Design a protein around this ligand. Structure first.
Ligand SMILES: [K+]
Ligand SMILES: [K+]
Ligand SMILES: [Mg+2]
Ligand SMILES: [Mg+2]
Ligand SMILES: [Mg+2]
Ligand SMILES: [Mg+2]
Ligand SMILES: [Mg+2]
Ligand SMILES: [Mg+2]
Ligand SMILES: [Mg+2]
Ligand SMILES: [Mg+2]
Ligand SMILES: [Mg+2]
Ligand SMILES: [Mg+2]
Ligand SMILES: [Mg+2]
Ligand SMILES: [Mg+2]
Ligand SMILES: [Mg+2]
Ligand SMILES: [Mg+2]
Ligand SMILES: [Mg+2]
Ligand SMILES: [Mg+2]
Ligand SMILES: [Mg+2]
Ligand SMILES: [Mg+2]
Ligand SMILES: [Mg+2]
Ligand SMILES: [Mg+2]
Ligand SMILES: [Mg+2]
Ligand SMILES: [Mg+2]
Ligand SMILES: [Mg+2]
Ligand SMILES: [Mg+2]
Ligand SMILES: [Mg+2]
Ligand SMILES: [Mg+2]
Ligand SMILES: [Mg+2]
Ligand SMILES: [Mg+2]
Ligand SMILES: [Mg+2]
Ligand SMILES: [Mg+2]
Ligand SMILES: [Mg+2]
Ligand SMILES: [Mg+2]
Ligand SMILES: [Mg+2]
Ligand SMILES: [Mg+2]
Ligand SMILES: [Mg+2]
Ligand SMILES: [Mg+2]
Ligand SMILES: [Mg+2]
Ligand SMILES: [Mg+2]
Ligand SMILES: [Mg+2]
Ligand SMILES: [Mg+2]
Ligand SMILES: [Mg+2]
Ligand SMILES: [Mg+2]
Ligand SMILES: [Mg+2]
Ligand SMILES: [Mg+2]
Ligand SMILES: [Mg+2]
Ligand SMILES: [Mg+2]
Ligand SMILES: [Mg+2]
Ligand code: NA
Lengths: 214, 101, 203, 144, 213
RNA sequence: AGACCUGAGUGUGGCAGGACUACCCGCCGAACUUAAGCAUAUUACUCAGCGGAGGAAAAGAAAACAACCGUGAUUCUCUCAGUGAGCGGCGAGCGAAGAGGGAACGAACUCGUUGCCGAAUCGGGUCUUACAAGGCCUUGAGUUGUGGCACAAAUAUCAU
RNA sequence: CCAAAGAAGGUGUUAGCCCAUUGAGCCAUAAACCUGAGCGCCUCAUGAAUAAGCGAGUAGCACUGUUUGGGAAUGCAGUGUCAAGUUGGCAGGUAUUUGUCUGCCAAAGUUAAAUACAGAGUAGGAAGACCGAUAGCGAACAAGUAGCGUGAGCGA
């Protein structure tokens, strides 16, 4: 008999199984360890080719969009030209010294821009710029001593010079203020929520009242 | 103008975490709303050279006999959009007013 | 410049003068071949926008395609199976006529590379498209950085794979985001993504 | 493993536990959920009431992220307070601050008795949770 | 996927006094009219042909894996459990056997072999040497021709100093930072004979922790 | 006379056709089967058919997401999710997207248009050790427009 | 007795020391590839110290057909009809008409990597809790061979 079971919805009604008459539609992961070894081998090979430049270019810090993730921070695509301008860098030049540039990203707040400007300033302080001609060094270029002392970043996210993404500091313990002991927080929040929730029907009542006025 | 700051709570008219908001930055796409004097002049010269389309002649005659509502319905069927229909009617009203003198 | 007057003149296709010009040209094109080589494009402003240049190695052809819906090529209009697949006259080709015109030209002249094409004229029974083609063996083409890419063999018969602008149009590639999720990078590619059964090693 | 299945025990039993009369045929009831209203109605009606029909309004393009709103009760608040701060917390003194949205919560609900007074930062709070935490020496601060 | 099914092979029907099984088409061949496609037919397809998306690998809880290594290590310090696993540890001075760090300076197998005799680990090595033989069965046709016993496991603090020990047949080398349960409990049986280097032994409390730390 | 527009003949220098086709791109496209019948549905935007490439292909630099403290070309992976989305004789069944953790990433460029110039352009001879990204010559092509400069990663450029 | 070599093949029985293997290292090289964008010469290029526009039988819309989870219509096709650019246009997943907001700027093109190789090839390699001559590819062998069919094909 059937009995008490979940009603099954396992799909699998297409020609997914490889057999005679069917090529199948499947994807196994038997090459996962070999590809993982290959990726690490390629990364170590690439670091040798680009030595002493960092393997990963510098990336900004951005806030994750959604209200579910807006408390989180992560690396962004590239630094905005407004951020690069505030750090005194031409964006086209910045792309030649391992800085990603993103001209789509806007800066809607000062806090988000300032933290990314700080990252660029820290990067420029630690930057060792090799000269085009070691016998004729121009300004802003490293001497022979620092050139021979150069080391490679090799970080997974390329953030040895600037550190990890910065999170806001946790609030320290304190005492309960006098207003907090008596203020009904639920009433304050509900009133604000109802103002938006019934904004349309409150104005219509008010607008219709003015029609009755005249 | 400076954007209105947020109140720091999850609900309300200016809800949201408080930051120091920055004003909208100028963009190269802002000139799309700038009047195009030269493009308008080129269209005027071309329009005078070629005359009126079959739709344009039909709409103009509607406005001559005073059937302004019927002109809008005729434009809407041909153009498929109400915003486009009004502009076509408005252009033909100006053309009718221009031909008076 | 002079382009603006040319461009705005071609937007008044229903005016008295433009219908007269197209009526004469449509009559002349009716009495020509299905594929005709031109010395110069009929719409130089339109051809240049699509990549044509007045240089050695650029060729323009006018191609004619017959209008109307596709008739299913079943014998005596008899289909089999479920009645859902019983239509003969009411189905439409999933490829536009501009893409058909490009494919006819590229298939006929295999020594050229189809770049782009544009609408020139219509008629009750015929549609005319002018196709821009490039000779890959020309020295002018082979040394021009703006057109050099077409020499590479990966662009051989790109119109047969739907890679031209008209091909991209009927593939749904004019759209992005939520309007094109199931057809990007292609319908088959998305189907493979959504229908292959995945067996992780440790599951 | 194959050596533990019923097949090994049924070697030599011929019918393999399916009977001589009814036998083991291909699909004697139909395939899958066939006949949910015909000849399988009793099984559907007594084990899955409500399966057939329609109900409620439609919501095209549902996004779960704007609807994110995990809740935590007042009597579970010690899960988010470090052990050393909980001991030092008492009504009238210095209390730890709990950031709910950084711990994965959006609303303070307020079931049960609170175990350690504290200042809770939350996006939402129930009317009972706000009343109980204030009577116990704590407070609720709204965040976004 | 195509094996045993590379034929036309239609059934003949009931009118002809033969079994209703698909039969190879054509003529002029000893295979024409022969049974086909069946798991019971010669040259046919096997029942339930094997597939590559079988579950070859397994997930194990991370805590359960560390529990097993911990239990295998505790068993290695019980001399009766080591003897019960088959190791000849009747002459070694102490269990767990901890030796000085200087073995990592050895360069010649002669020096390493002399050290194994001093701490009386050579008896378990000799047990492995005498057990070497051709594997019984089909596995010798594959690349599994020779079999032998396990022998002592020498644990070093790092990946250095193994140069003189690599060629010693019957001695396995381990890193204290990566201890493998498969080697600590061969065949699933606890009680492996482990020779600890002093530096590796002193790292055990940090690596595996304590009941309170 | 001649021109230039259109269209031919021949000489000279080249290219296409066929093979392969596992994967990939474009079209065309069933039925068995499932629904315990069957027609919508399903199998399946699959098989068969016709075309076209490459070591990959396709996609790709926002007429994109979102509705946030905001993200930022494309592709792929886990997850979102067999889904309190949705589609469906609302039956059988079917069924994604944003966000998040990652792989990769020196990732960006060109034309048309608009302004300012205007044959500075391209082929073909010939010379330099050179079918030079060079010089000189060339009506041959091109003013029915080839190239140059500047267009938000920008704020002169052009002679010295 | 050797072992920085115990490595699994061969040799008339089961081989570290009978043979071959197993390592530092040595020698030779079209071009290409990598190396203060390796380093000279000639030649040729080259960097630094004021307004206007922006892709038209296109986008839309109607009918039909198809496809999609996309539902008063997700993409597309045929025909008809066909714009805007004087805060314009497109998107914002329930149709309409308004007015506010947000993002972006279609109708021209090139582009490496991460991905596929579900009955492909070239040059090499590493393997297997697999099969073991009625098994495993049809084919361990002068196998797509002998043989059969007018043929497409079939096929030991
Ligand atoms: K069923
Ligand atoms: K389908
Ligand atoms: Mg019973
Ligand atoms: Mg019963
Ligand atoms: Mg049960
Ligand atoms: Mg078959
Ligand atoms: Mg240099
Ligand atoms: Mg049919
Ligand atoms: Mg995707
Ligand atoms: Mg997936
Ligand atoms: Mg699936
Ligand atoms: Mg019996
Ligand atoms: Mg019995
Ligand atoms: Mg039974
Ligand atoms: Mg039964
Ligand atoms: Mg019975
Ligand atoms: Mg009934
Ligand atoms: Mg209802
Ligand atoms: Mg077989
Ligand atoms: Mg023996
Ligand atoms: Mg045996
Ligand atoms: Mg070795
Ligand atoms: Mg089937
Ligand atoms: Mg049926
Ligand atoms: Mg049946
Ligand atoms: Mg039937
Ligand atoms: Mg096929
Ligand atoms: Mg690749
Ligand atoms: Mg490509
Ligand atoms: Mg993106
Ligand atoms: Mg779930
Ligand atoms: Mg489907
Ligand atoms: Mg991501
Ligand atoms: Mg992702
Ligand atoms: Mg020259
Ligand atoms: Mg130009
Ligand atoms: Mg041997
Ligand atoms: Mg060697
Ligand atoms: Mg150099
Ligand atoms: Mg545009
Ligand atoms: Mg149109
Ligand atoms: Mg369908
Ligand atoms: Mg539709
Ligand atoms: Mg439709
Ligand atoms: Mg492309
Ligand atoms: Mg192995
Ligand atoms: Mg035999
Ligand atoms: Mg055989
Ligand atoms: Mg055989
Ligand atoms: Na060399």
């Amino acid at each position: 008999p059937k009995g008490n079971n979940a009603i099954p919805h396992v799909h699998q009604k297409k020609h997914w199984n490889p057999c005679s008459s069917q090529k199948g539609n499947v994807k196994v992961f038997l090459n996962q360890p070999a590809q993982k070894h290959r990726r690490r081998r390629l990364r170590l090979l690439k670091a040798k080719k680009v030595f002493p430049r960092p393997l990963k270019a510098l990336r900004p810090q951005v806030n994750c969009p959604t209200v579910r993730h807006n408390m989180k921070r992560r690396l962004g695509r590239g630094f905005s030209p407004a951020e690069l301008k505030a750090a005194g860098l031409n964006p086209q030049y910045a792309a030649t010294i391992g800085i990603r540039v993103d001209s789509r990203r806007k800066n809607k707040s000062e806090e988000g821009m300032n933290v990314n400007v700080q990252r660029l300033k820290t990067y420029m302080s630690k930057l060792v710029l090799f000269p085009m001609n070691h016998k004729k060094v121009q300004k802003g270029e490293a001497s022979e001593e620092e050139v021979k002392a150069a080391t490679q970043d090799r970080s997974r996210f390329g953030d040895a010079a600037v550190g990890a993404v910065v999170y806001p500091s946790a609030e320290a313990p304190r005492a309960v203020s006098a207003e907090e002991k008596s203020m009904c927080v639920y009433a304050f929040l509900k009133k604000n929520h109802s103002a938006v929730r019934f904004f349309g029907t409150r104005s219509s009542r008010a607008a219709r009242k003015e029609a009755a006025k005249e | 103008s400076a954007p209105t700051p947020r109140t720091g709570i999850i609900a309300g008219f200016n809800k949201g975490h408080v930051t120091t908001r920055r004003p909208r930055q100028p963009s190269p796409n802002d000139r799309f709303a700038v009047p195009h004097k030269h493009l308008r002049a080129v269209k005027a010269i071309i329009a005078d050279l070629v005359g009126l389309s079959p739709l344009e002649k039909r709409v103009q005659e509607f406005l001559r006999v005073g059937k302004e509502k019927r002109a809008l319905k005729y434009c809407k069927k041909r153009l498929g959009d109400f915003t486009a229909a009004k502009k076509k009617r408005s252009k033909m009203e100006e053309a009718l007013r221009h031909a008076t003198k | 410049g002079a382009f603006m007057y040319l461009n705005e003149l071609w937007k008044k296709k229903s005016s008295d003068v433009m219908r007269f010009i197209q009526r004469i040209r449509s009559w002349e094109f009716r009495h020509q071949h299905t594929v005709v080589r031109l010395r110069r494009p009929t719409r130089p402003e339109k051809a240049r926008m699509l990549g044509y240049k007045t240089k050695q190695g650029f060729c323009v052809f006018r191609v004619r395609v017959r209008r109307g819906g596709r008739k299913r090529p079943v014998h005596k209009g008899i289909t089999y199976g479920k009645p859902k697949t019983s239509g003969v006259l009411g189905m439409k080709l999933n490829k536009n006529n501009q893409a058909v015109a490009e494919q006819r030209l590229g298939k006929r002249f295999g020594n050229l590379r189809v770049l782009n094409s544009y609408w020139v004229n219509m008629d009750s029974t015929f549609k005319w498209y002018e196709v821009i083609a490039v000779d890959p063996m020309c020295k002018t083409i082979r040394r021009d950085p703006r057109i050099n890419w077409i020499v590479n063999s990966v662009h051989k018969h790109r119109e047969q794979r739907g890679l031209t602008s008209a091909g991209r149009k009927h593939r749904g590639l004019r759209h992005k985001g939520h309007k094109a999720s199931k057809l990007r990078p292609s319908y088959r590619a998305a189907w493979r993504r959504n229908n292959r059964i995945v067996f992780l090693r440790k599951r | 493993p194959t050596r533990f299945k019923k097949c090994r025990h049924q070697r030599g039993s011929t019918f393999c536990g399916y009977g001589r009369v009814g036998k083991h045929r291909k699909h004697e009831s139909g395939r899958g959920n066939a006949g949910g209203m015909h000849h399988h109605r009793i099984n559907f009606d007594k084990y899955h009431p409500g399966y057939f029909g329609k109900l409620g309004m439609d919501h095209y393009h549902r996004k779960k992220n704007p609807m994110w709103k995990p809740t935590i009760n007042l009597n579970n608040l010690s899960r988010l307070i470090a052990a050393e701060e909980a001991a030092k917390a008492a009504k009238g003194g210095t209390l730890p601050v709990v950031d709910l949205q950084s711990s994965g919560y959006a609303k303070l609900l307020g079931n049960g008795h609170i175990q350690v007074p504290c200042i809770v930062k939350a996006r939402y709070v129930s009317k009972l949770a706000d009343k109980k935490i204030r009577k116990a020496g704590g407070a609720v601060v709204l965040q976004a | 996927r195509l094996s045993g099914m590379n034929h036309s092979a239609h059934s003949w029907g009931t009118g002809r006094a033969v079994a209703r099984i698909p039969r190879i088409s054509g003529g002029g061949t000893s295979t024409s009219g022969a049974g086909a496609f069946g798991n019971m037919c010669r040259g046919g397809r096997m029942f339930a042909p094997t597939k590559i998306f079988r579950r070859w690998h397994r997930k194990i809880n991370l805590h359960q894996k560390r529990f097993a290594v911990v239990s295998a290590l505790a068993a290695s310090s019980v001399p009766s459990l080591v003897m019960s696993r088959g190791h000849q540890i009747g002459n070694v001075p102490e269990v767990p056997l901890v030796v000085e760090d200087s073995i990592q300076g050895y360069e010649k197998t002669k020096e390493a072999m002399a050290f194994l005799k001093a701490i009386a680990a050579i008896d378990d090595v000799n047990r492995v040497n005498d057990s070497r033989e051709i594997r019984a069965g089909r596995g010798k046709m594959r690349n599994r021709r020779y079999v032998a016993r396990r022998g002592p496991m020498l644990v070093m603090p790092n990946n250095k100093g193994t140069r003189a020990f690599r060629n010693i047949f019957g001695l396995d080398l381990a890193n204290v930072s990566a201890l493998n349960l498969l080697h600590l409990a061969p065949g699933g049986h606890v009680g492996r004979f482990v020779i600890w280097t002093q530096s590796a032994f002193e790292q055990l409390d940090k690596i595996f922790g304590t009941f309170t730390e």
